[PDB]
């Protein structure tokens, strides 16, 4: 059971190339839960496994790395995911987090309210979203959702550094055509499902190294159908075995350079570096509530 020792499952190209109708998601182990290693919140394991998978991706990791974490609070008033991000990221990374409801966290900056009130003055390097709207549980047909996805799509288009990356939680019913289409503007993308929460239709839609141009033309409604087909076709065991050895958990200190360039100057070499996780393009000079 080698997959049980991985942090989770990533959507394979076998399913990305399919062409199927959107069906109901039916997981054999639906809503089963696994006990957690200790007095330890389940979201500790979920975020650690997302981070472990991102350790295998070509993330840009500069000094003073700019990370924004939406949907960071909880009904307990604490932020387990933000603390995991603090454990994972470089010590000099800046974490900004946000939630509709009040909470306390280990971020550098914590903003309360709708994510639309979060003004990102400068481009950022990494966006993590765990936002989910309770009304999504009141299910007619399963259509693409607006909600906070309109904001995130606009963020990707305007406030994300070239070379930057995103991990955005989706579910069977919480998803966006436009966000899937925007994954085609990254060097690579997938949907990643943690083993700690394998019994849920949750996945993290991953856009790795933003290029600002269309590399893959994705039909977003069809691609969600492919995601559901994949989940319906793929046994996944609940597991946290990947968290037994944490000696290499922390994000590698890559020292990725940050350059400012005009669009006319972005040539084949620069695109190659961006696509390999070896460069960010953005200012090197402010996230607040509007």
């Amino acid at each position: 059971a080698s997959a049980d020792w991985k942090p989770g499952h990533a959507m394979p190209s076998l399913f990305k190339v399919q062409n199927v109708n959107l069906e109901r998601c039916e997981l054999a182990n639906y809503k089963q839960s696994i006990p957690m290693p200790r007095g330890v919140h389940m979201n500790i394991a979920k975020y650690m496994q997302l981070c472990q998978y991102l350790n295998t991706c070509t993330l840009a990791v500069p000094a003073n790395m700019r990370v924004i974490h939406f949907g960071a609070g909880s009904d307990k008033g604490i932020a387990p995911g933000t603390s995991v991000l603090r454990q994972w990221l470089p010590t000099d990374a800046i974490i900004i987090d946000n939630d509709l409801n009040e909470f306390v966290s280990d971020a550098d900056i914590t903003l309360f309210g709708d994510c639309v009130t979060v003004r990102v003055g400068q481009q950022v390097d990494l966006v993590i979203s765990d936002m989910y709207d309770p009304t999504t549980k009141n299910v007619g047909s399963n259509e693409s959702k607006a909600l906070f996805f309109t904001y995130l799509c606009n963020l990707i288009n305007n406030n994300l550094a070239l070379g930057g990356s995103v991990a955005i939680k989706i579910t069977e019913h919480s998803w966006s055509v436009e966000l899937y289409e925007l994954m085609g503007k990254f060097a690579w993308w997938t949907v990643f499902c943690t083993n700690a929460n394998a019994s849920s239709s949750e996945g993290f839609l991953l856009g790795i190294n933003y290029l600002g141009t269309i590399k893959e033309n994705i039909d977003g409604g069809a691609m969600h159908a492919n995601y559901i087909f994949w989940r319906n076709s793929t046994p996944m065991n609940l597991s946290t075995y990947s968290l037994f050895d944490l000696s290499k958990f922390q994000l590698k200190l890559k020292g990725t350079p940050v350059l400012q360039l005009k669009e006319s100057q972005i040539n084949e070499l620069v695109i190659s570096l961006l696509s390999q996780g070896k460069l960010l393009i953005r200012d090197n000079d402010s996230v607040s509530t509007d």
């Binding site: 330890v40 500790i44 604490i78 944490l246 958990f249």
Partner: protein, 120 residues
Amino acid sequence: SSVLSLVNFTVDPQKAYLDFVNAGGAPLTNCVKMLTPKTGTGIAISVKPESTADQETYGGASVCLYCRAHIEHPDVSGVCKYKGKFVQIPAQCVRDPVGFCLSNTPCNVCQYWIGYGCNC
């Protein structure tokens, strides 16, 4: 949630919390316990987890009474000593991390807990 509202009807939150749990009151729950390689230095407060084999590491804001109760911090600098960092707790005190922190102080020269690591 009982004890959180209690520490808002008093001028001495540290004593009010400690008197409450010393009298059998339930410790504050939902401190953010991390998973760590128990291979750290063992200091009290650190930028990354530092639990040894005999400690657990918590996210710092979650074990700070002042952070958790959303009340004014006592530090004259106005800056919390835990928030944004990690706090190591002896493994035998994990029933009440907030109370452990209120009850103890890092050594000013070696930064290990006095009585729980400080060899000075």
